[PDB]
Amino acid sequence: MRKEAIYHRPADNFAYAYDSETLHLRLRTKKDDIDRVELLHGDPYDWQNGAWQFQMMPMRKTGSDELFDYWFAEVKPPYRRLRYGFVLYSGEEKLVYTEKGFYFEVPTDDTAYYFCFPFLHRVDLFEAPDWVKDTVWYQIFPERFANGNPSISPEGSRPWGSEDPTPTSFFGGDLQGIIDHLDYLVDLGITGIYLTPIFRSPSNHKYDTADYFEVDPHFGDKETLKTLIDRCHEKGIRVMLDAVFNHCGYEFAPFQDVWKNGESSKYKDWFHIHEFPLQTEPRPNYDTFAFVPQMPKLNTANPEVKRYLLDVATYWIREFDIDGWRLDVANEIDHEFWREFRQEVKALKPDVYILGEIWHDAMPWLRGDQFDAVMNYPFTDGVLRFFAKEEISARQFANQMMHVLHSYPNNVNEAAFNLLGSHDTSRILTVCGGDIRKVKLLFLFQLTFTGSPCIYYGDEIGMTGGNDPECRKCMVWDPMQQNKELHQHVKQLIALRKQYRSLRRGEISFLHADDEMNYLIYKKTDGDETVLVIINRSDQKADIPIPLDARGTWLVNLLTGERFAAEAETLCTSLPPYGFVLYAIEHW
């Protein structure tokens, strides 16, 4: 056994409470290096005859990535306290992995050797708003969704979809246009709407805010937003707003004051200024988003800034009842500010989904004291690499999916915001090089994946375009311009996701298929139901061997409803180029 590959540390994704009485424990070892792993556990104060009392619970291998196998075990501590270790087996070899290193036999003269999960507290528990688990979000870039009020459009607005957007072009999209098309979303199956910035700002993206307490006049007014939200709730749709708290706009009043009065300004400490007076040439002498002069970084450590942003955060929730906050550039704002943000948001309305824009590993913001989730761009990346660009095998794709999933606690992955693209990425159809077949697979995987998926407006009808701003074309409403194959496909999948619980909250496991280069086989199971998905990611037709049991197994095709019994061990499914099929399993 390779000790250098064995790992566990009593926190994060390796040790956590799943609920008020259950603890989850993981361990990772070198792939195929260990035959079995047993969790050694007991109450740290349970002694009898100078003998610490403990038991052995075999751990289940839940999956493996490129280098390791991940083992799982849940345990309900009798008195919510626990000391534990890991006994690894291989041939006649035996190893007791503990906090004090490895032993060859369970030491029991003391508990100090073992890892420790001191006490299970409801208060430290990770818990996200349960309703996001069954939600399928839809992202809207207001300036480009629908012009439902031509009079408020900024002069200079281009004719709808008359051309490709530019960093500064305008087409007149507004909040009214969203309301006018809600029926289109309801029909599609959407139950969540995520809006990019809608507060006063001079840009078409509005990430450079001028006033956080004002709806941009070009999108509408407060009454209009209130209607949109209530109109959404009427249809069972939740609404999430974008919080651009990392930086403000050049026209934010406090910043405009520091700009004119320099260091004497009462707002100078609301920012990160290196020298006075402030200047943008040759480069900003104050911290900013990226290196954008028009986007001054806010000082969230400043008591004033903190109170202002927190008011903003609570204002739109108490006055408009929004259901979520998407934290723009969340990772660049301090943790201290986020703990307060959460406390104040969750105290005002527990159901508010706190989503942070973090494109990378975000474990530190997902411990339960801060965000409920982050935009899963690592998911986006892996899925696109397999389905759109085909630059990795089914084998490597499975490894990457298992790797990112095991890097977080189970309850964290259940609330994850799984998107395929956004206003900051190129259009998926364009990443797929125009191949609708590939996009169908992307949507298939996303909608059969545990979490809270999000659809970028236009992706469901095949809109095209490279990265920002090309991905921000005006929403295509002309029926003859929308791709019906996709729309019905997406609608179908969302409806399936709603019917089968294993698709939105279950466990995913990949089954190795011969020619693990193009054939992707995986299943979702929540213990009650099992859905098997088979995907032929190749340009040729394929006869994919379904690795299942013979007599007793019955399958139901989810899309066609056809029911049939499994012959023997020879169940070969035939699929056309880039074809796929979903089956509900049954063992009698």
Add this chain to the structure above:
Amino acid sequence: MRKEAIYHRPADNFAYAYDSETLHLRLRTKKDDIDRVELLHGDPYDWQNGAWQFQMMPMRKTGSDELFDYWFAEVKPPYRRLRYGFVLYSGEEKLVYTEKGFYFEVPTDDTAYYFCFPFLHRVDLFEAPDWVKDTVWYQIFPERFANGNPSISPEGSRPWGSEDPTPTSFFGGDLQGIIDHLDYLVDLGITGIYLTPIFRSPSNHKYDTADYFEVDPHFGDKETLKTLIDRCHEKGIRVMLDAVFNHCGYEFAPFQDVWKNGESSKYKDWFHIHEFPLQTEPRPNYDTFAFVPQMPKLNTANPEVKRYLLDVATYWIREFDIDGWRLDVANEIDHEFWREFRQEVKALKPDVYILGEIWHDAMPWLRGDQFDAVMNYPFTDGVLRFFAKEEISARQFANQMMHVLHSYPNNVNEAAFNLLGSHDTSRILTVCGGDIRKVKLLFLFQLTFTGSPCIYYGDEIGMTGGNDPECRKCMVWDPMQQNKELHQHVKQLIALRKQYRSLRRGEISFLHADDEMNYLIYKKTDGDETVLVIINRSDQKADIPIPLDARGTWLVNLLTGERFAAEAETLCTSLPPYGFVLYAIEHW
């Protein structure tokens, strides 16, 4: 190159801010598997300014434990934002280790493969009071230090130090006794005093609190305490009290109320009751410390309990100006409470040292938002196993120290409470088997180790005893039964520590010798300041060859003061059984 052994993840001990402008980054690889490691780093938005090429910095190997090598690099991000990766050289082989995985060369495209440290916020920075780093604590179990007020001693107090202490015995130790012997501590060199519970409790240890707002009548009163703290302060001695917040005593009014009324009392939610009425056995029907019925666990989630406890925390600081809170059974209290705790305490007096009693890995409580340190018992284990029990070689000891040290951020280790024993462990002299020579080695290593070391009352004079309660004997004041050699050895070491910054704040490094089983060689570094320690852990004379650059190098025997240059290029030192020598290394 063993990939399964390589590891990094942006948080805790691998990536953290050392100070407002400096980042520290660690990398772990298989011991002797990687020859060199280069840190690939840049600003996440360098592309905006057209800076796609990474900057490169070589990492330094800071140590190795049983299995891994640990690499280190400090970086001062130009704009406090950082994206990085690692380039590992195993000879001809070359791998780029990133969040996305390993590659043969840094990816040529613009995809997010790298680890990221979003932003360096001063507010998130881990920061313990700077003075603890120069403090040498002295732990006092009051009931057994000195009887300076005979009139308040418990009714049946046995004659001072006449017999062995028992779980229920009393000897009339008190605060006046400490006050009366402060001069002894001043001569010893002590600058900080840690007292066990002194609040009203029926027991001799007082961990089962009756009232948190009342000094125990047998220990003294308000003006006695005030005096002691003032007297200590006027001599540069900080005072740390024992906070027993996890559980209260049987006589705690709020609890007395529940055991009397039951599911009717207004204090039912102040505790962890599973059923009514309350039972004490076979086991209590309510949570408690271990399974002690007289120590019911408090519900720190309850707003009333929390308020009362936070009141206790601030109360003693404000009124008596104490300098530290030693948190009893800290790991069993929730993180939310510890956060509020830190806020209110640092708000009231930023200099207060918040030390939590946690015997195991405590990274979850030392991320900067909770404790300043924990009682470093793992350190105690390794040090006793090498110097006292001789159950491990100098090599294995060196590995364990590197192990527990590299598991935390450098700034966390610089404030670590390194003790050799306590009121919950056996006397070091007894663990050494009566060999005073071995005890000198323990003190030698302790007082040359970075952090805020603590000495258990009596160990400086060689008192004996097995584990609780044997270790809680009355302090020996008659010099005839003290062993003055040991006492001056410790006085000497406390003197040197105060004189050489490398001993209390420096970096430690273990050099490898021949008899890497009994010979221990290590140096403390901080700038050019350097102290070389050589230890002969054997029962007989030894000639230990210590390789050290000659030329402009001068050695200063810190014990005698003797100076002299290096000649043999690989100097040889002759030591008696269990001998040792400290040399200040001067580069001229």
